[PDB]
Amino acid sequence: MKLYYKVGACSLAPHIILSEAGLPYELEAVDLKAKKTADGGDYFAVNPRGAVPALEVKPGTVITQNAAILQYIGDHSDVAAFKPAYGSIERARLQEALGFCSDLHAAFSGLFAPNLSEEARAGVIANINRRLGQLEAMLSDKNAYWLGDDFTQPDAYASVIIGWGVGQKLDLSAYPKALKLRERVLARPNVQKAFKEEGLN
């Protein structure tokens, strides 16, 4: 399978999950500004929404949307925690966390709009604080990872999102559970492998 990505963007979550699944996969960096694949082709032909991630499962079949991609990868892995049975409450919990990651993403994405006024930015920041506060309340000191004992796809997604906060030099020290979750995720060898594959430290 071939993952269309941009370094450090939300495609990093499926990149991580592909690495964790042990998945043979390939990687295609996308010029997101010009909407071009690496060979100069039109990325809109791959994803008409023009966003990453996209995952070519096989020639002619490209899945878009992080929730769909993350669960496709999981459902075709041998990692039981990545593929709970539909819906066992576990599947519902998996999808709820992924759904909430999309709420988190929507909040952070305002930060990256062009010609963002200071006033508009303040509103974005307040929303980010609110979403991060909600994430922190959702996480529990009783669980090693978001959903419990096992690392799952929303752990990778949450960690990338929190990563955008760090990269924007935002103070996340009031969200210690979220920071600890990301610390745990980044320590994983197959996570470090994915980072390395995007030329990231």
Ligand X SMILES: N[C@H](CCC(=O)N[C@@H](CS)C(=O)NCC(=O)O)C(=O)O
In the complex, which residues of this chain contact ligand X (CB under 6 A)? Answer: 9-10, 32, 50-53, 64-66, 99, 102-103
Q: Cβ of residue 30: shortest distance to a second copy, in angstroms?
A: 17
66 annotated to bind ligand: yes
Which element (helix H / strand E) includes 180?
helix 176-187
101 annotated to bind ligand: no
140 annotated to bind ligand: no
> Which two three-digit tokens encode residue 76?
């075709």
Instruction: Tell whether residue 61 is a contact of a second copy (CB under 8 A).
Output: yes
Residue 64 bridge partners (DSSP): 54
> Which two three-digit tokens encode residue 104?
């988190």
What DSSP letter does each residue of 135-174 carry, written as one string? Answer: HHHHS-TT-SBTTBSS--HHHHHHHHHHHHHHHTT---TT
Q: How far is CA 144 from the centre of its chain?
A: 19
Q: Coil, strand, or helix at residue 95?
A: helix
Which is nearer to ligand X, 19 or 153 (by Cβ)?
A: 153
Q: What Å distances lie between residue 147 and 70, 94, 144, 158, 171, CA to CA?
A: 15, 7, 8, 12, 25
Distance between CA 60 and CA 16 in Å, rounded?
Answer: 24
Indicate the length of the chain as a whole number.
201
Among 64, 129, 190, 192, contact with a second copy (rule: CB under 8 A): 64
Q: Which among ligand X, a second copy, none contacts residue 76 (Cβ within 5 to 8 A by kind)?
A: a second copy
103 annotated to bind ligand: yes
Which is nearer to a second copy, 22 or 87 (by Cβ)?
A: 87
Q: Cβ of residue 51: shortest distance to ligand X, in angstroms?
A: 3
Instruction: Tell whether residue 168 is a contact of a second copy (CB under 8 A).
Output: no
Distance between CA 191 and CA 189 in Å, rounded?
Answer: 5
Instruction: Tell whether residue 177 is a contact of a second copy (CB under 8 A).
Output: no
Residues found near a second copy in the complex (CB under 8 A): 48-49, 57, 61, 63-69, 71-72, 75-76, 83, 86-87, 89, 91-96, 98-100, 102-103, 106, 120, 134, 137-138
**Binding residue positions:** 10, 35, 52, 65-66, 102-105
Residues in binding site for glutathione: 10, 35, 52, 65-66, 102-105
